[PDB]
Scaffold this motif. Structure first.
Motif, short mmCIF file in Angstrom:
data_model
loop_
_atom_site.label_atom_id
_atom_site.label_comp_id
_atom_site.label_asym_id
_atom_site.label_seq_id
_atom_site.Cartn_x
_atom_site.Cartn_y
_atom_site.Cartn_z
N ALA A 1 74.24 33.71 42.15
CA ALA A 1 74.19 35.03 43.24
C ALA A 1 74.16 35.68 42.41
CB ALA A 1 74.80 34.41 44.39
N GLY A 2 74.31 37.27 42.28
CA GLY A 2 73.71 37.41 43.10
C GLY A 2 72.67 39.04 42.04
N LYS A 3 72.89 40.14 43.39
CA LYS A 3 72.23 41.17 42.99
C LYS A 3 72.81 42.10 44.28
CE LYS A 3 71.19 41.12 38.35
NZ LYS A 3 72.44 41.20 37.71
N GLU B 1 71.59 39.95 50.76
CA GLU B 1 71.27 38.73 49.87
C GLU B 1 71.03 37.71 50.79
OE1 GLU B 1 72.64 35.78 48.48
OE2 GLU B 1 74.80 35.51 50.11
N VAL B 2 69.69 36.35 50.73
CA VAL B 2 69.16 35.78 51.10
C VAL B 2 69.89 34.13 50.76
CG1 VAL B 2 66.81 36.96 51.38
CG2 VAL B 2 67.43 35.36 49.29
N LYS B 3 70.64 33.37 51.83
CA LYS B 3 71.65 32.78 51.92
C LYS B 3 70.37 31.46 51.10
CE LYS B 3 73.82 28.91 52.76
NZ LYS B 3 73.80 28.88 51.48
N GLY B 4 70.99 31.55 49.62
CA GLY B 4 71.00 30.56 48.90
C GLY B 4 70.71 28.82 49.46
#
Lengths: 49, 50
Positions: free
Chosen positions: B5-7, B25-28
């Motif tokens: 992660a991430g940007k 931020e989408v939960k990895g």
């Protein structure tokens, strides 16, 4: 006569959750003004021209 | 196994709350890795008369 009834005085309250980089203040009371009989107030005119 | 992660997108310098306009931020996803164990065999023989 001319009496103002109230059942909550000025109060002051505040949050933080679920805020977002902010704190915020609320103030809320309960009150009104009442003409009891019919009369006893006089004003004007004092019009326009 | 998790991913990097991430940007995160920086703010527009004027939007300080209601609303902040930062990244979502989408939960990895945790990615499975599965292992498979194959078999082999060999056989041999002789006779007691040889």
């Amino acid at each position: 006569n001319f009496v103002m009834p109230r059942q909550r005085a000025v109060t002051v309250e505040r949050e933080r959750q679920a805020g977002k980089q902010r704190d915020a203040y609320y103030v809320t009371q309960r009150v009104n003004l009442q003409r009891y009989f019919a009369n006893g107030v006089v004003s004007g005119t004092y019009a326009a021209s | 196994v998790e991913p990097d992660a991430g940007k995160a997108t920086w703010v527009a310098a004027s939007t300080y709350g209601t609303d902040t306009t930062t990244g979502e931020e989408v939960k990895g996803a945790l990615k499975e890795i599965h292992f498979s164990t194959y078999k082999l065999a060999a056989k041999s023989f002789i006779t007691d008369e040889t």
